[PDB]
Design a protein around this ligand. Structure first.
Ligand SMILES: [C][N][C][C][C][N][C][C][C][N][C][C][C]([O])N1=C2C(=O)[N]C(=O)N=C2N([C][C]([O])[C]([O])[C]([O])[C]OP([O])(=O)OP([O])(=O)O[C][C]2O[C](N3[C]=NC4=C3N=[C]N=C4[N])[C]([O])[C]2[O])C2=[C]C([C])=C([C])[C]=C21
Ligand SMILES: [C][N][C][C][C][N][C][C][C][N][C][C][C]([O])N1=C2C(=O)[N]C(=O)N=C2N([C][C]([O])[C]([O])[C]([O])[C]OP([O])(=O)OP([O])(=O)O[C][C]2O[C](N3[C]=NC4=C3N=[C]N=C4[N])[C]([O])[C]2[O])C2=[C]C([C])=C([C])[C]=C21
Ligand SMILES: *[C@@H]1O[C@H](CO)[C@@H](O[C@@H]2O[C@H](CO)[C@@H](O)[C@H](O)[C@H]2NC(C)=O)[C@H](O)[C@H]1NC(C)=O
Ligand code: NAG
Lengths: 462, 459
């Protein structure tokens, strides 16, 4: 059976790997860009390679082994460091200078955590259909008895750090039932390890690919003709007997099946035209789910002016404006020679910032930095890097987020195949949507569904 | 039966009135503040009275008569004016100076309206249980095929003026099924009339109260002992046999029933302790619904520097920061020669702003207006009024908003009685939550439910 796999990110490479494993080796993997890895992708910044996309193996040291972890920590030995959030309370900056009192912040953090813990008990009881779901925010109100959620500068940046920094949209839009507690952590463990290796976290994808695609003996570059880069799929026609796929350079390919691994943002954008058009139930499922954006703004400075030391890796800025340049990280461990800082924004701020110059963004950030460090002589960043994933037509965002309003059945419709067209990718991961491991496992699952129909002539889905 | 009514806003007054008409006259209305009217409340600013709360009669000229209308326009003849939004396309300002090309903006507005129209069609086809509901934003993504809703400054301010300015929260949190289309406009008509009368929109409430409460023959002041101001209920105990209500000043009253008209934000706050605690289902329905905040920032200037004339009443500021001081209104008709502007903000901006000084807010607003009218010498406002409804313990917000996730059944639970504890108010309105006519009809509906149960034992 010939299978065309659209996209060579983690899930498309993972899906193809599993099909190969089932002996389905007549494969054609069409990747839009000139490389594989998708959302796991590094870039040079300031003399070092930093990750524009995924940066952590999240969910480590728990009861089950996160399948990505061994690859990273053992097989490839990708350099990495466990992130420690224990010292956050000593690192929350006032809008107008200096940090707040540690004990005061610690109390606010413990309050926020206990609300979430009560949230997990409610969640366990909600009807499985997802019909009684509510936003994380509704749960926060319920639990603290207030007509609003965190609303002071400190509580809002703690809230932003707890939720938005993980999910990339606010609690008020996020599904309680599907995120608190979160399976990644319940299953795999609470820790997260930040990868900081010149080869890039994407080395994981190259590794998996090389397990079934031919590579050059001296360079180890993949040379298998089954992988074709710079091929942007723009049309998929499918019928009872087969499928035909066309790329922008006009190539046309045929197969028994197609496995689509493009992001939910790409599916929301209409880059790929389906013929016939996908069914309405499928179209609605696609638009109802959220594709979030998480912008990692790196900055390079001619000298250090922030704290380094125990518990200094992560720090927050308590702006009176929610989500305004709030979550900071310094790299004394990851990039010691560097002088780099990383401030993370998402959602509304991400869209605003992608739409303006990097210089304008640098200037807003320098204003924030000077306020945080009024006692220092804060030099201007000599370099800044603003990833623009939402604007990139091959991604249209960074990762899915389960919103209040998408029920269990609607989420199944988002993954469901349509004739010979199958879907895979992080947004199709039943319990790990939004993660590299979620992409990895979604690839195997989608492939298996396809294997069933193709090899076991079991084609009915659900 | 003796009934205690908590609060003398529109719904309390209205419910007490319906009870009275049913013969239930042994009433005790306990109001926290020193006056009746609640969310319909005026104040003097720059020598004129402007409305801190509700300002329009929304839904006029349609298939059915909005009950508030005749009272406003025929009974009391409060001075008012139809708002016309037709010229908006000529009044949308760029973040850094001047207005956008009118034809361009007019097309963005039509696109927005067309998307909403399609949402209305979609909405009509959603299962009644609410299982297919989605946010207005999800409908926008679906209808235009994008991974996001309005996202350029101009599209965002139009989006804000179309939804947040009505609902006080963004489309991404709002239930499509329960807001588009909106009953208030579908039933009562598309027009809205801005009330600008010195007696205040609140006159409507005073007139209602006066139909059954006693007032001084000279004064005209309500002097009925059944109305007690400055009574802040802090505790309501109930049993199968009656209820007891305690006030912050230590009074204690007893009755057969209690009708709670305090806002949803009040109920979400714990200012009133129920003993025993309300059931879990009630409490959940309460915290699930949203209590939105809409802040009307009035400003006074030594002279005008903004446009006046046909279509100039309403204008937008398209900041690249969504919802930042974006919706403006000038009062050439309402308050001639006063030199007052009104900029409206809600939700996140309302809470941030209520937490900072008026002076800080004034300064932010002056930077904006200077950006909007670079060609002018813009004087600093001489006076500013920043209402703080969210911060006010007796309101905790301005009006409810229906969030995605809540279905009709959970909404209905919000209105349900608990034993002898009845509830009324805008958040209990079957089809008009969030409005004055909604508080009005809610009072009558809640009262009739109590009447049937108490008097016919048909609960
Ligand atoms: C408990 N405690 C905790 C603390 C907290 N922390 C915080 C931090 C976290 N945050 C969140 C997250 C982030 O960071 N990131 C990440 C990480 O880190 N980790 C993980 O896991 N993850 C993440 N993410 C996500 C990821 O990356 C994803 O999911 C994946 O990767 C996905 O994959 P898939 O599904 O496969 O997809 P992609 O990659 O996209 O692929 C696809 C492909 O396809 C292609 N195309 C398109 N279209 C087309 C094509 N071809 C052809 N034709 C056509 N048409 C493309 O190109 C590709 O390749 C993340 C992400 C991101 C981005 C970021 C920024 C971040 C993150
Ligand atoms: C188509 N075209 C259209 C265009 C659009 N434009 C935009 C405009 C609109 N916006 C939105 C709305 C607003 O404006 N507003 C209004 C108006 O105008 N109108 C209407 O209708 N409405 C409105 N609003 C709402 C109203 O006001 C409400 O709903 C009502 O009033 C409510 O009533 P009720 O329910 O009865 O409530 P209140 O008043 O609150 O009352 C209660 C009472 O109680 C008391 N308390 C409390 N706590 C307590 C007590 N007592 C005793 N004890 C205790 N503990 C209080 O004090 C009271 O009196 C509105 C509103 C507002 C606020 C604003 C600002 C605005 C608005
Ligand atoms: C990540 O990988 C390292 C690499 O081995 C692990 O550290 C080794 O663990 C084995 C297990 O006992 C020891 O015999 C080695 O002495 C350890 N090596 C070093 C350099 O300490 C490590 O535990 C892994 N971390 C996680 C979280 O799995
Ligand atoms: C409002 O009242 C005036 C007073 O008679 C009347 O002329 C006018 O047509 C009324 N407008 C509406 C919308 O009823």
């Amino acid at each position: 059976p010939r299978v065309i796999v659209v996209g060579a990110g983690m899930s498309g490479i993972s899906a193809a790997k599993r099909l190969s494993e089932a002996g389905i080796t007549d494969l054609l993997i069409l990747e839009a860009t000139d490389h594989i890895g998708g959302r796991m992708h590094k870039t040079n910044f300031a003399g070092i390679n930093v990750e524009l996309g995924a940066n952590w193996v999240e969910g480590v040291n728990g009861g089950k082994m996160n399948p990505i972890w061994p690859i990273v920590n053992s097989t490839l030995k990708l350099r990495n460091f466990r992130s420690d959030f224990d010292y956050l309370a000593q690192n929350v900056y006032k809008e107008d200078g200096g940090v707040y009192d540690e004990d005061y912040v610690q109390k606010r953090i413990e309050l926020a955590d206990s609300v979430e813990e009560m949230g997990e008990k409610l969640s366990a009881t909600l009807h499985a259909s997802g019909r009684d779901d509510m936003s994380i925010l509704a749960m926060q109100r319920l639990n603290e008895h207030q007509p609003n959620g965190p609303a002071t500068p400190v509580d809002m940046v703690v809230d932003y750090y707890k939720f938005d920094y993980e999910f990339a949209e606010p609690p008020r839009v996020t599904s309680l039932q599907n995120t608190v507690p979160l399976a990644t952590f319940s299953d795999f463990g609470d820790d997260v390890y930040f990868v900081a290796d010149q080869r890039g976290y994407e080395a994981v994808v190259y590794y998996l690919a090389g397990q079934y695609l031919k590579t050059d003996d001296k360079s180890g570059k993949i040379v298998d003709p089954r992988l074709q880069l710079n091929k942007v799929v723009r049309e998929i026609k499918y019928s009872p007997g087969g499928v035909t796929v066309k790329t922008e350079d006009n190539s046309v390919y045929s197969a028994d099946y197609v496995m689509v691994s493009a992001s939910l943002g790409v599916l929301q954008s209409d880059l790929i035209q389906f013929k016939p058009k996908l069914p309405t139930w499928k179209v609605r499922a696609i638009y109802q789910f959220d594709m979030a954006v998480y912008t990692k703004i790196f900055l390079k400075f001619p000298r250090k002016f922030w704290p380094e030391g125990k518990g200094r890796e992560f720090f927050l800025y308590a702006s009176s404006r929610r989500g305004y340049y709030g979550v900071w990280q310094e790299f004394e461990k990851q990039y010691p020679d560097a002088n780099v800082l990383l401030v993370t924004v998402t959602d509304e701020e991400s869209r605003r910032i992608e739409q303006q110059s990097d210089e304008q963004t640098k200037a807003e950030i320098m204003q924030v930095l000077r306020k945080m460090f009024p006692g220092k002589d804060v030099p201007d960043a000599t370099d800044i890097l603003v990833p623009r994933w939402w604007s990139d037509r091959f991604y249209k965002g960074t990762f899915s987020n389960w919103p209040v309003g998408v029920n269990r059945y609607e989420y199944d419709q988002l993954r469901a195949p349509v004739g010979r067209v199958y879907f895979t990718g992080e947004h199709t991961s039943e319990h790990y949507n939004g993660y590299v491991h979620g992409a990895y496992l979604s690839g195997i699952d989608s492939a298996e569904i396809l294997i069933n129909c193709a090899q076991k002539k079991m084609c009915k889905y659900h």
